Design a protein around this ligand. Sequence first.
Ligand SMILES: *[C@@H]1O[C@H](CO)[C@@H](O[C@@H]2O[C@H](CO)[C@@H](O[C@@H]3O[C@H](CO)[C@@H](O[C@@H]4O[C@H](CO)[C@@H](O)[C@H](O)[C@H]4NC(C)=O)[C@H](O[C@H]4O[C@H](CO)[C@@H](O)[C@H](O)[C@@H]4O)[C@@H]3O)[C@H](O)[C@H]2NC(C)=O)[C@H](O)[C@H]1NC(C)=O
Ligand SMILES: *[C@@H]1O[C@H](CO)[C@@H](O[C@@H]2O[C@H](CO)[C@@H](O)[C@H](O)[C@H]2NC(C)=O)[C@H](O)[C@H]1NC(C)=O
Ligand SMILES: *[C@@H]1O[C@H](CO)[C@@H](O[C@@H]2O[C@H](CO)[C@@H](O)[C@H](O)[C@H]2NC(C)=O)[C@H](O)[C@H]1NC(C)=O
Ligand SMILES: *[C@@H]1O[C@H](CO)[C@@H](O[C@@H]2O[C@H](CO)[C@@H](O)[C@H](O)[C@H]2NC(C)=O)[C@H](O)[C@H]1NC(C)=O
Ligand SMILES: *[C@@H]1O[C@H](CO[C@@H]2O[C@@H](C)[C@@H](O)[C@@H](O)[C@@H]2O)[C@@H](O)[C@H](O)[C@H]1NC(C)=O
Ligand SMILES: *[C@@H]1O[C@H](CO)[C@@H](O)[C@H](O)[C@H]1NC(C)=O
Ligand SMILES: *[C@@H]1O[C@H](CO)[C@@H](O)[C@H](O)[C@H]1NC(C)=O
Ligand SMILES: *[C@@H]1O[C@H](CO)[C@@H](O)[C@H](O)[C@H]1NC(C)=O
Ligand SMILES: *[C@@H]1O[C@H](CO)[C@@H](O)[C@H](O)[C@H]1NC(C)=O
Ligand SMILES: *[C@@H]1O[C@H](CO)[C@@H](O)[C@H](O)[C@H]1NC(C)=O
Ligand SMILES: [Ca+2]
Ligand SMILES: [Ca+2]
Ligand SMILES: [Ca+2]
Ligand SMILES: [Mn+2]
Lengths: 449, 371, 63
Amino acid sequence: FNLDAEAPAVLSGPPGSFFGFSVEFYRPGTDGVSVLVGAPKANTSQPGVLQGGAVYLCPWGASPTQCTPIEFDSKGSRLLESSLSSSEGEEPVEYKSLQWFGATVRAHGSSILACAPLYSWRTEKEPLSDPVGTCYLSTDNFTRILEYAPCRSDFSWAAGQGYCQGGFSAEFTKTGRVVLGGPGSYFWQGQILSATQEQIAESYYPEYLINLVQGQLQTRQASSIYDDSYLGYSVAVGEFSGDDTEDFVAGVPKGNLTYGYVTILNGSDIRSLYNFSGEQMASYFGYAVAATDVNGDGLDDLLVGAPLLMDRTPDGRPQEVGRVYVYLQHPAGIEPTPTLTLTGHDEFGRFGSSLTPLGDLDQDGYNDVAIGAPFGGETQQGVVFVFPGGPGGLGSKPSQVLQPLWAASHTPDFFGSALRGGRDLDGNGYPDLIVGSFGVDKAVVYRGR
Amino acid sequence: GSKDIKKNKNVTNRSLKPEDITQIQPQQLVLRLRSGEPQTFTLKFKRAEDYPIDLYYLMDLSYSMKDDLENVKSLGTDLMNEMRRITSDFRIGFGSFVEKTVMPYISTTPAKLRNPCTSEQNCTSPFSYKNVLSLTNKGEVFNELVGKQRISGNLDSPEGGFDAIMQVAVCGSLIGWRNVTRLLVFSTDAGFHFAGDGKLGGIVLPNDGQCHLENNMYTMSHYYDYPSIAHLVQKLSENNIQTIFAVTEEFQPVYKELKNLIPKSAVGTLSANSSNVIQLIIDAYNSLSSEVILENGKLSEGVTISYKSYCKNGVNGTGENGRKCSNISIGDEVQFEISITSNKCPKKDSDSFKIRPLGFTEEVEVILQYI
Amino acid sequence: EVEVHGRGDIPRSSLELFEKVAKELGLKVERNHRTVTVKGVSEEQIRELEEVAKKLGLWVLVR
Ligand SMILES: *[C@@H]1O[C@H](CO)[C@@H](O[C@@H]2O[C@H](CO)[C@@H](O[C@@H]3O[C@H](CO)[C@@H](O[C@@H]4O[C@H](CO)[C@@H](O)[C@H](O)[C@H]4NC(C)=O)[C@H](O[C@H]4O[C@H](CO)[C@@H](O)[C@H](O)[C@@H]4O)[C@@H]3O)[C@H](O)[C@H]2NC(C)=O)[C@H](O)[C@H]1NC(C)=O
Ligand SMILES: *[C@@H]1O[C@H](CO)[C@@H](O[C@@H]2O[C@H](CO)[C@@H](O)[C@H](O)[C@H]2NC(C)=O)[C@H](O)[C@H]1NC(C)=O
Ligand SMILES: *[C@@H]1O[C@H](CO)[C@@H](O[C@@H]2O[C@H](CO)[C@@H](O)[C@H](O)[C@H]2NC(C)=O)[C@H](O)[C@H]1NC(C)=O
Ligand SMILES: *[C@@H]1O[C@H](CO)[C@@H](O[C@@H]2O[C@H](CO)[C@@H](O)[C@H](O)[C@H]2NC(C)=O)[C@H](O)[C@H]1NC(C)=O
Ligand SMILES: *[C@@H]1O[C@H](CO[C@@H]2O[C@@H](C)[C@@H](O)[C@@H](O)[C@@H]2O)[C@@H](O)[C@H](O)[C@H]1NC(C)=O
Ligand SMILES: *[C@@H]1O[C@H](CO)[C@@H](O)[C@H](O)[C@H]1NC(C)=O
Ligand SMILES: *[C@@H]1O[C@H](CO)[C@@H](O)[C@H](O)[C@H]1NC(C)=O
Ligand SMILES: *[C@@H]1O[C@H](CO)[C@@H](O)[C@H](O)[C@H]1NC(C)=O
Ligand SMILES: *[C@@H]1O[C@H](CO)[C@@H](O)[C@H](O)[C@H]1NC(C)=O
Ligand SMILES: *[C@@H]1O[C@H](CO)[C@@H](O)[C@H](O)[C@H]1NC(C)=O
Ligand SMILES: [Ca+2]
Ligand SMILES: [Ca+2]
Ligand SMILES: [Ca+2]
Ligand SMILES: [Mn+2]
């Protein structure tokens, strides 16, 4: 329909680097508009670091669209002071190798946020391998790069935040606040964790590895019965309480004895506001979440995805086709039951793996939504669907379907695994879309017409 | 339309070889569909007197289940002694699973990489899945091998046994599966890892469902993600494997729902240090073998099927239950009413599909002839 | 006071042994789902309980 599927732009990174695992827009609607692409397994030029991850900057407008890597950090793994002081010599405190840095790239204005979920660091007290989360926050066009590792705290073990794996999912609120989700905190209970950029910069002090941010907001620890809930597997932001501050949306895929549920946390607090339980057990309810107005009422509406949901064809044979649930918001409040459900049509397609608002892509007054099926298509290469909005919510039939142009190969292409949209690159007033294909280390950019 | 029965070999009567025993009366027939008008036929099922059994014991060897491993050193001979009353042919096997060997699930420090448990306990390094003993008819070897197994340790409460189930089901000849009643016992006392949890370890490739066993050890545990329940159901159904869940009382509801999802499987309540595994297995087998589920394979487009059940004791079920006949005992005849509908004239002159009871290699061949 | 957890991949059997030793030690035990907390534990009592928990592989705390 609208998106120029005839000939999109293709950005390719180093082979085997998982280029395109995460995508984002940078400085849209202004000079210097660019596309950020993460390569979690890209070899970097850091001292003694192997596959430390990288984030690429791809300027828009240039005909070749050459992509270059950003030098967020060029310092190898640190060393323990006692090790070099005592009869040890070398004993790194941190383990930056294979840290999967750049697995989550988010930007808001002049700020960028690249996280390394698998960062682990030997505790200075006793030997350990706690894989806490560490994130870097570029500010003012790379003028001052900070580091945000909130889960790297005194409580250091699986019983605490040692296995937090913070930065597994990140987001920026409209006011620049940073929201993080640590799935592995408190014996994999999970944890939402946020702080404003001003607080991060004010308390920055790189001498101490354990740095505490003042005024930080985080979810408290719960009883042992809530273990292995994976709260924070995916996060999103939207206005759901009638306040002026965007409210947090977090996914808990393995909560409620593996049925799963999604929770909305109040702004200015971290209190829970709404719960949305899953439908089928092991339907991985909460792979992705989003919040956008899909009926032009001016109120945000929640979307959820369950890629592993199993449905049976009318013949009787069961099949694995994903699902997506849409909850519409009303002046009274959101309802606990879905207002609409969308189901896949291909086996092992993982429909609903990724979701992303597209904005008023059609300029018809109703926002649109894009849903990805990493293993869909007629050759298991991956497919992306576009579902138009309307007065009654999302339309049950996709308006457009996007597929890769390159021929299939022996490795899965993971096309549509990561998506982003809602910003205009060419500046013609029509939103755009970026789709990740890290299976072959490629990212494609689509533009309205 | 019309119909005609081609082979229709008489089902074995009351009281040889697993392939010489018949349990479906009609075998092959041709249905000449006439578009709107459907065609119907009936097939008799009769449970065989004694049918060989192949049991594969898959046990969880995390630090939890430590006491259980101490009360299983006599299972090999006890189960065979308690099983001879049911069948004259029996074979048993053993297998163990702990977890994927990657960072978030297992501590990677060398001290914890060699001795995952505390220094007081002398544990072994973690492993994904090990095939201790292929199916065999001697219980002494089972006892001897299971006696010397060593417990392991891990970090997170849920254990990654689903990939072990996949490797057991798909490896076939390596596990020694036969064309008889295949039973799988899944003993654990914690939740399970399914697809999507491997992302925390940097694993994104979906499980491909292939035998990746090298020297009775499952490599590639770091390469492929955990298998989804849909994949497990598909592979178990394809391989005709009936699963028994012997899990503790704490995690009963999770496995009750799992057995609801999976077809032809039962869930037991393991107690104490595996005190009553034998009785649990026998009860589960008796419950499973007293039911029949009929399924069809890839019915052609434009063709719809209907099942009817003529059970015992005068209860005649219909609807989705028409393919299910419960409470069947040894040598108790049962009949099904099957009708095929074809609401078009597909270009395929004659396409055939097979109706097969779950867990059996016996198939009835149905050949369609449109117009 | 002492609050052992034993909530990871730890046997259920080696979690009521701590409760039995604490109760037979004259202290008070506040049972919980895969978590035990005691009250009125002295310095010697706390040291002994911590040593026992460490030997059992539990995660001992203090309050
Ligand atoms: C959406 O769905 C989620 C997931 O189910 C819900 O999350 C759960 O909500 C429960 C609602 O009560 C919470 O229970 C409460 O948890 C708090 C915090 O843990 C308890 O208070 C503190 O508990 C800790 C636990 O160790 C103690 O150390 C503290 O001393 C307690 N006090 C303070 C000030 O922190 C609550 O205690 C109440 O309940 C117990 C129950 O026995 C009672 O004995 C107490 O006297 C007291 O009345 C209470 O347990 C769950 O913790 C929470 N779980 C998670 C993972 O977040 C959420 O509520 C749902 N929201 C909606 C809107 O539906
Ligand atoms: C990053 O570089 C390393 C080493 O240069 C690659 O790991 C392998 O290293 C051995 C030598 O130690 C080479 O012989 C191999 O060729 C390297 N692998 C490959 C695929 O070339 C590592 O693979 C590189 N990572 C990426 C993403 O290319
Ligand atoms: C979300 O949290 C804010 C922060 O407290 C709540 O706003 C408070 O509302 C109470 C209600 O009387 C007032 O007494 C406080 O002064 C308010 N504080 C602030 C900072 O605004 C808000 O009500 C919460 N949202 C919901 C839906 O309850
Ligand atoms: C389960 O195992 C326990 C522990 O082995 C048994 O109780 C006894 O515990 C002591 C130590 O506390 C051991 O020295 C004994 O060997 C154990 N008895 C036996 C028979 O092994 C318990 O009896 C076993 N059965 C249960 C609990 O039903
Ligand atoms: C923003 O930055 C772009 C890239 O340069 C970056 O900033 C300089 C200072 C170096 O740190 C370099 O390594 C970084 O990659 C520029 O192309 C762009 O012009 C800058 N924006 C403005 C408004 O000047
Ligand atoms: C957990 O899931 C079940 C089944 O979907 C549901 O009935 C139950 O309400 C859920 N838990 C909660 C706390 O709602
Ligand atoms: C644990 O037991 C095995 C069995 O003999 C032994 O070889 C090993 O040395 C023991 N562990 C240690 C640390 O000695
Ligand atoms: C079992 O039946 C299958 C069905 O096709 C057949 O291929 C196989 O040869 C038979 N024998 C064994 C040992 O599996
Ligand atoms: C069930 O079917 C049998 C055999 O046709 C018949 O004798 C009996 O009356 C039927 N009873 C019911 C309740 O359908
Ligand atoms: C099975 O049948 C027997 C007698 O034929 C009856 O006593 C028993 O209640 C039946 N069980 C079920 C579950 O219908
Ligand atoms: Ca709305
Ligand atoms: Ca629109
Ligand atoms: Ca545009
Ligand atoms: Mn365990």
